[PDB]
Amino acid sequence: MRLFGYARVSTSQQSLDIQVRALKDAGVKANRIFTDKASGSSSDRKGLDLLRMKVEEGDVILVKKLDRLGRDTADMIQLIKEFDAQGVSIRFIDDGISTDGEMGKMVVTILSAVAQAERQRILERTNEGRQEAMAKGVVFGRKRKIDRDAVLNMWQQGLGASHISKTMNIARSTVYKVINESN
Amino acid sequence: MRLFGYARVSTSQQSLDIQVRALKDAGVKANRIFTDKASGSSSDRKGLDLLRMKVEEGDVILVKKLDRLGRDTADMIQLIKEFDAQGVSIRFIDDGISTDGEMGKMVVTILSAVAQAERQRILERTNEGRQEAMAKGVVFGRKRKIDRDAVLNMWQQGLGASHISKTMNIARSTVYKVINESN
DNA sequence: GCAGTGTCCGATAATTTATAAA
DNA sequence: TTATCGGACACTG
DNA sequence: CAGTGTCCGATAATTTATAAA
DNA sequence: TTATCGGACACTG
């Protein structure tokens, strides 16, 4: 049937070639193969997108390794679930992991699980660690740098908010805010 | 064959009983259940080291979920690899996953697929800055702390290495390292 | 003839680069 | 998360 | 209009964690 | 990856 191949790389066009050539080894059609660069689950999906819409059911997507499907293991899982529901099977060449055949159903269910767990593992640790950091008094956020004392002084000296901004090179909002926030 | 149970515990004993109860609700004999309070600090696992010994080929171990059988994915990988070769299988109740014979191999493959996959992704991304910045000239590594000037002075003053270390709380070796750096 | 002296590594330690959330 | 612009949305004058 | 002062969404800069070098 | 630490050898005063 229609066989497709997905590749992706951060910057290394070289690492991409290696994938693409390894993909062709099984799936010859380069028009079907869809590559990507500038990795990002926050915005990068373009190439994969052309793949999505072209891929009908009973199709096979060939990837080189798990680390080539999505930026975050989460993303990868999301796609796997996606294509699967549409009836498309993803087969990771090197890893020998496939989402079709008898294994299929279980492979995906295992995939989602091992991933399910790690997401918690890291979250738990972040929460746990942010708590202690907080208890210790660790201050989060942008370290104040505005010379709040200066803004206040000038203001006391009959100066105008506008001047305090124009000469200090800060926004009127922070100037008024500094004054207003203070006790 | 025997039906055994296992439970790694988060926090402590209080969280435990809930897991030990679920396994009883599953069917494990209330005395054929093994628990481990997640020590964290050291790699010991007393209850588990018992299970690993009472089990003989054919047995079955039941456990609530993947992250209740191991700490880090890598622990599960080999831990499972052990139970498998030994002919023992494990069932992750709330996951459907079972290392039943061949499956065992498939479960571990995923575990080591996602672990290196997630690893590669992260190294993939930082790789940009790691090389760019490195070439650029940013200084990498631990910030220097020992007062090298004072060190070399004492040395230039005729004071021996043993004195320098004692006097400024530095490691004697460091006295030498600092002395050799460019001198 | 008990601390000091160097030369050398294996442990910890600290930090950098990037991203995800917060 | 927290701090800082970046204007927009009024008002009195 | 243009001098204030107000309020808010959209950026910045940081902190925790991840992982490795 | 670079910094420091804590010791180890094999001697040296």
Contact assignment for B110 to A110 by CB distance below 8 Å: yes
Residues of B designated as active site: 10
CA distances from B116 to A73, B66, B67 (A): 11, 18, 18
Stated in angstroms to one decimal place, the resolution of this structure is 3.0
CA distances from B153 to A82, B156, B165 (A): 68, 5, 13
Tell how strand A60-63 and strand A3-6 pair up: parallel
Query: Helix, strand, or coil here: B68?
Result: helix
Instruction: Name B34's Cβ contacts closer than 8 Å, sequence gap at least 6.
Output: B4, B5, B6, B7, B47, B48, B50, B51
CA dihedral A60, A66, A70, A72 (to 10 degrees): 150
Q: Name which of B73, B103, B121 is nearest A114 (Cβ-Cβ).
A: B73
Measuring alpha carbon to C1', the residue closest to nucleotide C8 is B173
Q: B76 to chain A: nearest residue by CA?
A: A114
The residues of B between 138 and 167 with beta carbon within 7 Å of nucleic strand F are 139-146, 148
Q: Name which of B66, B103, B109 is nearest A117 (Cβ-Cβ).
A: B66
Task: Report d(CA A15, CA A147) in Å as an integer.
Answer: 49
Task: Report d(CA A1, CA A149) in Å as an integer.
Answer: 72
- Name the DSSP letter for residue B179: H
Contact assignment for A115 to B114 by CB distance below 8 Å: yes
Task: Pick out the nucleotide with least CA–C1' distance to B168.
Answer: F4
Contact assignment for B65 to A103 by CB distance below 8 Å: no
Q: At what angle do helices A46-54 and A73-86 cross, to 10 degrees?
A: 10
Q: Which of A182, A169, A181, A175 shows the shortest CA–CA distance to A151?
A: A175
Q: Mind listing the domains of chain B with CATH numbers?
A: 1-98 (3.40.50.1390), 99-140 (6.10.250.10), 141-183 (1.10.10.60)
DSSP chain A: --EEEE---SS-HHHHHHHHHHHHTT---TTT-B---S--TTT--HHHHHHHHH--TT-EEEES-GGGT-SSHHHHHHHHHHHHHHT-EEEETTTTEESSTTTHHHHHHHHHHHHHHHHHHHHHHHHHHHHHHHHTT---SSPP-S-HHHHHHHHHTT--HHHHHHHHT--HHHHHHHHHH--
Task: Report d(CA A163, CA A147) in Å as an integer.
Answer: 15
Contact assignment for A115 to B116 by CB distance below 8 Å: no
Considering only residues 26 to 45 of chain A, which have any Cβ-Cβ distance to chain B shorter than 8 Å? 39
The residue type of A174 is T
In angstroms, what separates the C-alpha of A56 from chain B's closest C-alpha? 26
